[PDB]
Symmetry: D2
Subunit: 114 residues, 4 copies
Amino acid sequence: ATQGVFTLPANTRFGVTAFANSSGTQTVNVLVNNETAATFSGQSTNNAVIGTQVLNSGSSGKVQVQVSVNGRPSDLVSAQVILTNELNFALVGSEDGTDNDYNDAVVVINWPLG
Amino acid sequence: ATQGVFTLPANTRFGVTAFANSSGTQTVNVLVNNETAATFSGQSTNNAVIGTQVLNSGSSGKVQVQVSVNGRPSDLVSAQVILTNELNFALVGSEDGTDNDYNDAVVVINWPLG
Amino acid sequence: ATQGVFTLPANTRFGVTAFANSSGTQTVNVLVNNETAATFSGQSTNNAVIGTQVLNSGSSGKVQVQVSVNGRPSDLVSAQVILTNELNFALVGSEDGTDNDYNDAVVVINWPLG
Amino acid sequence: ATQGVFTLPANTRFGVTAFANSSGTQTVNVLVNNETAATFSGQSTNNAVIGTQVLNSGSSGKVQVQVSVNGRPSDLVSAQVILTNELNFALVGSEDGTDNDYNDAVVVINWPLG
Ligand SMILES: C[C@@H]1O[C@@H](O)[C@@H](O)[C@H](O)[C@@H]1O
Ligand SMILES: C[C@@H]1O[C@@H](O)[C@@H](O)[C@H](O)[C@@H]1O
Ligand SMILES: C[C@@H]1O[C@@H](O)[C@@H](O)[C@H](O)[C@@H]1O
Ligand SMILES: C[C@@H]1O[C@@H](O)[C@@H](O)[C@H](O)[C@@H]1O
Ligand SMILES: [Ca+2]
Ligand SMILES: [Ca+2]
Ligand SMILES: [Ca+2]
Ligand SMILES: [Ca+2]
Ligand SMILES: [Ca+2]
Ligand SMILES: [Ca+2]
Ligand SMILES: [Ca+2]
Ligand SMILES: [Ca+2]
């Protein structure tokens, strides 16, 4: 099944934050309406924040997260959670190796803002 | 129901990160085994990452998030989600006012790390 | 925070199923647009299905679950999960007593159907 | 990533319920400790409950859901959600075709019972 793809409400501000937990340098790309809108890179084995940004979902609402490590695409897991019918989280983990911890880059998208 | 309380794997490092989306200055307290382990504060209406830290869940694994604004406890919502039977997120929203957006402080706990 | 309230896409069929795990008889009411659309009742300590139905979210999409036992509303917990950006679950637990198992009536809403 | 595999607490009763939404007859097999413990079959486009059953997770706690249509495995999605640090849902969707609604068989696992 496809993972890392989320439909947000149109024309809505959202936060996107990435963390790293791997020996490999993580490159996280965030696409809005199929065009790169943010890119983060960094290395950590201690959950460092490798980037944070606020984006707009635009007319389509389509947001996609991609992760690669030294040009190799990582396998993704994802889901969306809604609390009290208002607070949204889109969650992504990724695996760059063999241990299947799926934390090598972790991406959190949240909305609404403000 | 109680919210913002999570049983983590014992003796395990976890990430905790807080975001602010309110006119009010947020204060986030993270308790491990019923003792304060981290405190974050800030004021933003644009999802600022007012704190991020790595903690250990200790011998009991009990982690609790509390949020206040000008000394008043915020109302909390929370849940935990597990992806691919391994990757964990504990999620908290909070409301300091009357609009019920529940984003005024948002807290994400993630494990495993490394 | 409010629990057991979900906004579905408008005019969309959804399934609702309720389970019982309590000494007490559970009555589950499902409201669409703030009017009762289905009512289930039964008693089990073995997770019996006490009702299942397909409903239409209607023009507003506003669906609410309420649970009563022994003449008093139960305390509710809830969240919504979306898998592969397609498959939606709205989940409710309820507590009618003192043990805080929150399983006394369990309600699952799923969409889309067909 | 692997989907439809969950680790439950050992020696714990749990509920498993399957729904169908497809032209194809769904076959759902629930394995405990790698051995089939329940099987359900049926065709519906209207979310019929093709089976429900209470099982014990046994010494291993390992529970796996498999879905097929006339012997062809369906593609699975899954996640687990915990409410108020106590009430557990393991969720599975499956796709037998090309439309990626992932509802063709839907399986819900819930614990604790009683
Ligand atoms: C330090 C190690 O780096 C990579 O091999 C990751 O895939 C592992 O999960 C671990 O983080
Ligand atoms: C700017 C406003 O600040 C407070 O009133 C918050 O409770 C609102 O949600 C909003 O963020
Ligand atoms: C048999 C018992 O019945 C009620 O007291 C419930 O609140 C308990 O959770 C338990 O199910
Ligand atoms: C009636 C149709 O039957 C199969 O093709 C399913 O894969 C579709 O999702 C739809 O339910
Ligand atoms: Ca890894
Ligand atoms: Ca890792
Ligand atoms: Ca607010
Ligand atoms: Ca706010
Ligand atoms: Ca109870
Ligand atoms: Ca009970
Ligand atoms: Ca399908
Ligand atoms: Ca279908």
